[PDB]
Amino acid sequence: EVQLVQSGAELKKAGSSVKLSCQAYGVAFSTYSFHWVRQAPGQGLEWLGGFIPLVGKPNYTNKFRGRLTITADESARTTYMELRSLRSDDTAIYYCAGGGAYSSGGGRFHYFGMAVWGQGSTVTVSSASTKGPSVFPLAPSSKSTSGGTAALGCLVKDYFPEPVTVSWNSGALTSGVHTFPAVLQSSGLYSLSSVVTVPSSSLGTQTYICNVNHKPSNTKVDKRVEPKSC
Amino acid sequence: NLWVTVYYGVPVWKDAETTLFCASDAKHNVWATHACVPTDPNPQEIHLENVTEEFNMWKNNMVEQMHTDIISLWDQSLKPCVKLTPLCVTLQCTNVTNNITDDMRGELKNCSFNMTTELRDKKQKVYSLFYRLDVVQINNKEYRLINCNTSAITQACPKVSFEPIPIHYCAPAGFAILKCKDKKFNGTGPCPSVSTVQCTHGIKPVVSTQLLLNGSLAEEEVMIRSENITNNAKNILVQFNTPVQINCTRPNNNTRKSIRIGPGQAFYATGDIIGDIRQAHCNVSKATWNETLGKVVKQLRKHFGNNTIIRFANSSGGDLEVTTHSFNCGGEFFYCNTSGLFNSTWISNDSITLPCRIKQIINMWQRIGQAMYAPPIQGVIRCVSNITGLILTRDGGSTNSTTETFRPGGGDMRDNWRSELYKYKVVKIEPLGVAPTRCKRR
Amino acid sequence: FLGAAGSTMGAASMTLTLTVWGIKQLQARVLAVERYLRDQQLLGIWGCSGKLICCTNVPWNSSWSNRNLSEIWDNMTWLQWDKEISNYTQIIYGLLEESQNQQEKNEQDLLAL
Amino acid sequence: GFLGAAGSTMGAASMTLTVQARNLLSGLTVWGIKQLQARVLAVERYLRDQQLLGIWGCSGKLICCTNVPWNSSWSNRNLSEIWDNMTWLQWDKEISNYTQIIYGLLEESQNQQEKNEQD
Ligand SMILES: *[C@@H]1O[C@H](CO)[C@@H](O[C@@H]2O[C@H](CO)[C@@H](O[C@@H]3O[C@H](CO)[C@@H](O)[C@H](O[C@H]4O[C@H](CO)[C@@H](O)[C@H](O)[C@@H]4O[C@H]4O[C@H](CO)[C@@H](O)[C@H](O)[C@@H]4O)[C@@H]3O)[C@H](O)[C@H]2NC(C)=O)[C@H](O)[C@H]1NC(C)=O
Numbered sequence: 001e002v003q004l005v006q007s008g009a010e011l012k013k014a015g016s017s018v019k020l021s022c023q024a025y026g027v028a029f030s031t032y033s034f035h036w037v038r039q040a041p042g043q044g045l046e047w048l049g050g051f052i053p054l055v056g057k058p059n060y061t062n063k064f065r066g067r068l069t070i071t072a073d074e075s076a077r078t079t080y081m082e083l084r085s086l087r088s089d090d091t092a093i094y095y096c097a098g099g100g101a102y103s104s105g106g107g108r109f110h111y112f113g114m115a116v117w118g119q120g121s122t123v124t125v126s127s128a129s130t131k132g133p134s135v136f137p138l139a140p141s142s143k144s145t146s147g148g149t150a151a152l153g154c155l156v157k158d159y160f161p162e163p164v165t166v167s168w169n170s171g172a173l174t175s176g177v178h179t180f181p182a183v184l185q186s187s188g189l190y191s192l193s194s195v196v197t198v199p200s201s202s203l204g205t206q207t208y209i210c211n212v213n214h215k216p217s218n219t220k221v222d223k224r225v226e227p228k229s230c
Numbered sequence: 231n232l233w234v235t236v237y238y239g240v241p242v243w244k245d246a247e248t249t250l251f252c253a254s255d256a257k258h259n260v261w262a263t264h265a266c267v268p269t270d271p272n273p274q275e276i277h278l279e280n281v282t283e284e285f286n287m288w289k290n291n292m293v294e295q296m297h298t299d300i301i302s303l304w305d306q307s308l309k310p311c312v313k314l315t316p317l318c319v320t321l322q323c324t325n326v327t328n329n330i331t332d333d334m335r336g337e338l339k340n341c342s343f344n345m346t347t348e349l350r351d352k353k354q355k356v357y358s359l360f361y362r363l364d365v366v367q368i369n370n371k372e373y374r375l376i377n378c379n380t381s382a383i384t385q386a387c388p389k390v391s392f393e394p395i396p397i398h399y400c401a402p403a404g405f406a407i408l409k410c411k412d413k414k415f416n417g418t419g420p421c422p423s424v425s426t427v428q429c430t431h432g433i434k435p436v437v438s439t440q441l442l443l444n445g446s447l448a449e450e451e452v453m454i455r456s457e458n459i460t461n462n463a464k465n466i467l468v469q470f471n472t473p474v475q476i477n478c479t480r481p482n483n484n485t486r487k488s489i490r491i492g493p494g495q496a497f498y499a500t501g502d503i504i505g506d507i508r509q510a511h512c513n514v515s516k517a518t519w520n521e522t523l524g525k526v527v528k529q530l531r532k533h534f535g536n537n538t539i540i541r542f543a544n545s546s547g548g549d550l551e552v553t554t555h556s557f558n559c560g561g562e563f564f565y566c567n568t569s570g571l572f573n574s575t576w577i578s579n580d581s582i583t584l585p586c587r588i589k590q591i592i593n594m595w596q597r598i599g600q601a602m603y604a605p606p607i608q609g610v611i612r613c614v615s616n617i618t619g620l621i622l623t624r625d626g627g628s629t630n631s632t633t634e635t636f637r638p639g640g641g642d643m644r645d646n647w648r649s650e651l652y653k654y655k656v657v658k659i660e661p662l663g664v665a666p667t668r669c670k671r672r
Numbered sequence: 673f674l675g676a677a678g679s680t681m682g683a684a685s686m687t688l689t690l691t692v693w694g695i696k697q698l699q700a701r702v703l704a705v706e707r708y709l710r711d712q713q714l715l716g717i718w719g720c721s722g723k724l725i726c727c728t729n730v731p732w733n734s735s736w737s738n739r740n741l742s743e744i745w746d747n748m749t750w751l752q753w754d755k756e757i758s759n760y761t762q763i764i765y766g767l768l769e770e771s772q773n774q775q776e777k778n779e780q781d782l783l784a785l
Numbered sequence: 786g787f788l789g790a791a792g793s794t795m796g797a798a799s800m801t802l803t804v805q806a807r808n809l810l811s812g813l814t815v816w817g818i819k820q821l822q823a824r825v826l827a828v829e830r831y832l833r834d835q836q837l838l839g840i841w842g843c844s845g846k847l848i849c850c851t852n853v854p855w856n857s858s859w860s861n862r863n864l865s866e867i868w869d870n871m872t873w874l875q876w877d878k879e880i881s882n883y884t885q886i887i888y889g890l891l892e893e894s895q896n897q898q899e900k901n902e903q904d
């Protein structure tokens with residue numbers, strides 16, 4: 001199976017430059033077609049540039065002319081996208097996608113779309129500094145129990161920039177898990193809550209741990225949630 | 231609206247048979263490697279990704295071509311040589327004494343006979359030394375040569391060497407050789423790691439029985455291969471992981487004499503051995519053979535079960551070529567007794583000496599009608615070789631047999647070169663295809 | 673050389689660019705010359721000489737293969753494709769020759785006036 | 786099939802050139818050497834014809850137009866009785882006398898064309 005692996009999140013200032021990498025596994029790199037597609041928060045998809053390593057001539061949209069460069073390292077089986085003169089509207093999630101093509105001779109190439117997508121890299125353009133998140137336990141109690149079901153969670157507060165990944169019991173607990181979208185507080189830092197509903201009889205026997213990871217600040221916190229002692 | 235489009239150079243191939251020529255690394259040798267094309271210093275090998283091919287070790291058409299080529303070269307080298315027709319006379323023979331040992335009693339014979347002169351009017355009386363395996367008693371004693379009731383002998387030309395030289399088999403343009411790179415390939419079935427080449431590696435035509443010498447070694451483990459492993463009428467081929475050294479020697483200091491049998495025709499007889507007369511033999515290492523047999527038993531148990539008793543016993547019945555390890559060491563032909571190599575049972579510093587005999591009238595390729603005389607070689611003879619495999623056979627033990635018995639085999643030279651050409655196949659390239667597109671000719 | 677044998681058809685479309693021994697050598701030389709000349713002549717009679725990808729004027733008959741262009745150039749290999757249309761190769765080969773002869777005649781007619 | 790239009794008129798047989806074109810290249814003992822010289826001879830004849838075509842500017846073509854005007858001394862028949870009332874086998878017997886003159890004319894004309902085009 002073809003797989004595309006992208007780099008991690010990035011924080012940049014206005015006027016700087018950003019470089020993202022995308023590594024391909026399972027195909028002959030030179031004859032595959034690779035494209036870059038960005039998505040702004042709450043908006044639709046936008047196509048930035050596409051490129052076949054063997055031909056070597058990238059194609060760009062006119063809006064990003066002069067600021068976008070697409071290169072390839074065949075030995076590493078990687079493709080690089082470089083964006084310059086970043087602005088506030090450049091904050092987005094960037095996906096690396098791939099698709100096959102064929103030739104009928106005479107400079108004619110016909111495509112089929114982007115069939116394989118990467119996981120995406122979040123690039124945030126802002127002057128604020130990176131801050132680690134604070135994790136607090138939203139403990140189960142008599143006020144959080146309804147019909148034998150008790151809710152317990154973790155509040156992740158005061159971090160910058162997005163994103164943060166939150167799992168339960170190292171991914172073992174997925175049923176009933178609601179991870180709420182991050183909200184931008186007035187202080188400029190993000191906050192969210194990740195909660196799970198479990199049987200009330202399992203509170204005294206099952207250990208619940210929320211694992212939060214904020215890659216931009218290199219923060220990894222495993223917080224145990226227990227009913228409040230009385 | 232689709233149209234036909236022509237593509238020249240597509241990667242398609244089919245199974246084929248063709249004539250392969252020879253390339254050799256850049257003068258009198260049986261296999262005329264001086265007439266072969268020079269070899270490229272760095273040959274090109276192309277790995278074929280995501281390709282699975284089907285190989286069959288036991289239906290390769292390269293083996294038959296190699297067999298025919300070897301036999302044709304052997305016959306071609308023997309045409310200008312001297313015919314020994316007047317040698318089929320009645321010899322008067324006696325036993326050779328004077329510093330023979332107790333093991334060499336009656337193995338050499340002193341035989342006198344009347345020979346034709348260069349004048350077709352008078353005869354001469356001459357004598358020569360013959361091995362006991364070359365003469366037959368007829369009723370001192372009267373003997374005759376072994377062959378003078380089935381074939382005629384031709385004396386091998388003494389300036390020709392029997393030393394094997396590596397040969398590369400090459401395919402013509404429009405053909406390719408697929409090669410299997412799997413390290414656990416058993417010769418038959420799909421090989422999920424394939425490469426393509428134009429030439430095979432150097433292959434030495436070593437003629438021997440019961441033991442493969444100077445060949446190639448396996449890369450991971452001892453390999454056992456057979457066409458149908460449950461059919462005991464099929465030979466089992468064993469490929470070693472590490473070679474076993476063997477030292478073979480003929481310690482007599484021989485002498486050569488020339489007898490003129492006609493105008494321009496000479497016969498090379500044996501004169502007198504100076505010094506004492508001793509037996510020829512080969513040495514193998516005991517510990518290394520024990521280790522190799524243990525590994526072979528361990529790999530053989532995967533076809534017969536965890537708890538079967540596996541025993542090795544010597545050969546049984548047949549001609550001297552088949553019942554002995556027969557080979558050729560620097561001109562002389564040896565037939566060695568391997569009853570100490572295969573004598574053991576396996577339940578779930580020192581040396582082994584194999585005594586050998588020497589024969590001078592040779593019948594090759596299991597043929598009748600063409601014998602060849604090998605002229606004597608002067609001085610002591612010694613050579614060193616690597617054992618790198620085995621040819622085995624199994625007995626048909628019925629009636630709830632919990633033990634299996636394996637015996638050394640051989641005799642057919644196709645199994646010798648099937649152990650080298652087992653990863654190769656020849657294919658034909660077809661670089662022309664048609665496909666539908668949406669474009670039209672202007 | 674034969675490096676795209678396991679890739680899709682579309683990916684592979686981008687990268688199309690005496691004595692005992694003495695008797696055996698001569699036959700190999702003759703065979704190579706014969707094969708080269710046969711392939712060149714077959715290309716020539718179709719009007720495709722000097723090209724590696726050549727566009728023809730013969731419509732594709734759906735009875736040869738009814739698959740879409742997505743499962744041909746993105747899902748098969750040339751070895752898989754050769755197994756499907758092997759029975760119809762000679763029909764297409766004759767059609768190409770007739771089509772090229774018609775083109776030659778039409779060019780002559782155009783030059784006539 | 787092969788040579789099937791041998792009795793057809795010169796116009797009806799001009800549409801079957803590819804049928805005869807492909808049947809010209811592939812279509813030790815007593816029998817051993819009688820088969821190799823045949824292959825070599827076929828290859829040499831094919832190459833000679835191809836070179837003759839190529840040096841006239843007609844390389845890789847079935848019908849090729851030239852700059853040599855038709856000298857009336859060769860033949861005086863009009864086109865209505867050549868392409869509709871004659872056959873190639875009947876046409877060859879008439880103009881078999883003047884073939885080499887035309888061949889030399891074609892060679893010189895093509896060489897002149899190349900020489901003045903490259904200039
Ligand atoms: C497996 O491989 C090993 C290693 O490759 C092989 O062992 C080698 O065997 C060869 C052949 O026996 C041996 O080479 C001989 O060694 C001696 C010293 O060089 C010589 O006896 C001999 O040269 C004479 O014979 C040649 C053959 O014609 C002549 O070209 C040469 O001029 C010599 O002939 C002169 O001398 C002889 C006797 O002196 C005389 O009769 C002649 O008239 C003439 O005057 C060869 O070079 C190697 O030394 C061996 N190598 C090792 C390491 O032991 C082994 O044979 C292979 N096994 C099998 C089964 O094939």
Ligand SMILES: *[C@@H]1O[C@H](CO)[C@@H](O[C@@H]2O[C@H](CO)[C@@H](O[C@@H]3O[C@H](CO)[C@@H](O)[C@H](O)[C@@H]3O)[C@H](O)[C@H]2NC(C)=O)[C@H](O)[C@H]1NC(C)=O
Binds near residue numbers: 280
């Ligand atoms: C054709 O052969 C190639 C080479 O063997 C195959 O490529 C391999 O594909 C597998 C997936 O099928 C890749 O595994 C994945 O790789 C990374 C790193 O481990 C990761 O995404 C996954 O955890 C997984 O392991 C493998 O890396 C890749 N190998 C190479 C060298 O690219 C290919 O799949 C074969 N094609 C088909 C159609 O089977």
Ligand SMILES: *[C@@H]1O[C@H](CO)[C@@H](O[C@@H]2O[C@H](CO)[C@@H](O)[C@H](O)[C@H]2NC(C)=O)[C@H](O)[C@H]1NC(C)=O
Binds near residue numbers: 328342357502
């Ligand atoms: C083989 O026999 C011959 C005779 O047939 C032996 O040669 C003779 O040996 C005697 C005794 O030494 C000499 O007197 C003679 O001159 C020798 N020659 C002849 C022609 O008679 C020879 O020694 C014997 N060889 C062996 C190895 O036993």
Ligand SMILES: *[C@@H]1O[C@H](CO)[C@@H](O[C@@H]2O[C@H](CO)[C@@H](O)[C@H](O)[C@H]2NC(C)=O)[C@H](O)[C@H]1NC(C)=O
Binds near residue numbers: 458459
């Ligand atoms: C390998 O040989 C064995 C015989 O040694 C074959 O097995 C026999 O098959 C026949 C029918 O063809 C049966 O009647 C016998 O009873 C079988 N013998 C045994 C001992 O089971 C076997 O089929 C051969 N394998 C192949 C692949 O042909």
Ligand SMILES: *[C@@H]1O[C@H](CO)[C@@H](O[C@@H]2O[C@H](CO)[C@@H](O)[C@H](O)[C@H]2NC(C)=O)[C@H](O)[C@H]1NC(C)=O
Binds near residue numbers: 581
């Ligand atoms: C094979 O080994 C034997 C036995 O070790 C060697 O023959 C001689 O053996 C005696 C004792 O039986 C020793 O005293 C000698 O030293 C051995 N001979 C030599 C020359 O050293 C024999 O030499 C060995 N074979 C080879 C080919 O070297």
Ligand SMILES: *[C@@H]1O[C@H](CO)[C@@H](O[C@@H]2O[C@H](CO)[C@@H](O)[C@H](O)[C@H]2NC(C)=O)[C@H](O)[C@H]1NC(C)=O
Binds near residue numbers: 475476477614
């Ligand atoms: C076969 O003969 C070789 C030599 O041709 C022997 O190797 C020698 O062994 C002695 C005794 O251990 C060492 O001193 C030498 O250094 C070795 N020579 C080389 C070149 O390696 C070998 O031992 C013999 N093998 C057998 C089984 O007899």
Ligand SMILES: *[C@@H]1O[C@H](CO)[C@@H](O[C@@H]2O[C@H](CO)[C@@H](O)[C@H](O)[C@H]2NC(C)=O)[C@H](O)[C@H]1NC(C)=O
Binds near residue numbers: 544546553567
């Ligand atoms: C296999 O080994 C057996 C047993 O060692 C050999 O049989 C011996 O043959 C000799 C004559 O060559 C007799 O004197 C012995 O009495 C036999 N032994 C037994 C136990 O019967 C047999 O020759 C060997 N087979 C070969 C070498 O092919």
Ligand SMILES: *[C@@H]1O[C@H](CO)[C@@H](O[C@@H]2O[C@H](CO)[C@@H](O)[C@H](O)[C@H]2NC(C)=O)[C@H](O)[C@H]1NC(C)=O
Binds near residue numbers: 567568569
């Ligand atoms: C191969 O070797 C074996 C074992 O040395 C030979 O068997 C011996 O044969 C002799 C007579 O040649 C008997 O006196 C011994 O008793 C036998 N030994 C055993 C252990 O049985 C066998 O004959 C040889 N093969 C031959 C010469 O073909």
Ligand SMILES: *[C@@H]1O[C@H](CO)[C@@H](O[C@@H]2O[C@H](CO)[C@@H](O)[C@H](O)[C@H]2NC(C)=O)[C@H](O)[C@H]1NC(C)=O
Binds near residue numbers: 615
């Ligand atoms: C026989 O086996 C020996 C021992 O493995 C081989 O000698 C090796 O040769 C390679 C290639 O030249 C060397 O790199 C190794 O160092 C050698 N090994 C030792 C232990 O010396 C030899 O090549 C084999 N083949 C022949 C024909 O003798």
Ligand SMILES: *[C@@H]1O[C@H](CO)[C@@H](O)[C@H](O)[C@H]1NC(C)=O
Binds near residue numbers: 321322342343344
């Ligand atoms: C050789 O011939 C002589 C006399 O011609 C005869 O006595 C003798 O038996 C013959 N054979 C020999 C010496 O083997």
Ligand SMILES: *[C@@H]1O[C@H](CO)[C@@H](O)[C@H](O)[C@H]1NC(C)=O
Binds near residue numbers: 366
């Ligand atoms: C030739 O003689 C040998 C030895 O006596 C004998 O075994 C063999 O059968 C004979 N061959 C023929 C064909 O008569």
Ligand SMILES: *[C@@H]1O[C@H](CO)[C@@H](O)[C@H](O)[C@H]1NC(C)=O
Binds near residue numbers: 416418419420455
């Ligand atoms: C060789 O391996 C194949 C599977 O690849 C198996 O079917 C076959 O029986 C094997 N042969 C032997 C002799 O083990």
Ligand SMILES: *[C@@H]1O[C@H](CO)[C@@H](O)[C@H](O)[C@H]1NC(C)=O
Binds near residue numbers: 504609
């Ligand atoms: C063999 O005999 C010859 C001739 O007598 C002698 O020169 C040579 O040294 C001998 N070789 C030995 C004893 O190894």
Ligand SMILES: *[C@@H]1O[C@H](CO)[C@@H](O)[C@H](O)[C@H]1NC(C)=O
Binds near residue numbers: 516517520
């Ligand atoms: C070979 O191994 C077997 C099995 O362990 C053993 O019985 C025998 O003595 C060994 N031979 C040796 C070490 O020479």
Ligand SMILES: *[C@@H]1O[C@H](CO)[C@@H](O)[C@H](O)[C@H]1NC(C)=O
Binds near residue numbers: 535536
């Ligand atoms: C035979 O015994 C070996 C010992 O290592 C074991 O690995 C193998 O599985 C056994 N074979 C069976 C149980 O079929």
Ligand SMILES: *[C@@H]1O[C@H](CO)[C@@H](O)[C@H](O)[C@H]1NC(C)=O
Binds near residue numbers: 569570573574
């Ligand atoms: C086979 O091995 C047995 C047991 O060690 C031994 O008695 C016998 O002599 C051997 N046979 C040979 C070496 O021929």
Ligand SMILES: *[C@@H]1O[C@H](CO)[C@@H](O)[C@H](O)[C@H]1NC(C)=O
Binds near residue numbers: 756759
């Ligand atoms: C091609 O023809 C062969 C031989 O008649 C037949 O077996 C095969 O099914 C045919 N294939 C197709 C796709 O028509």
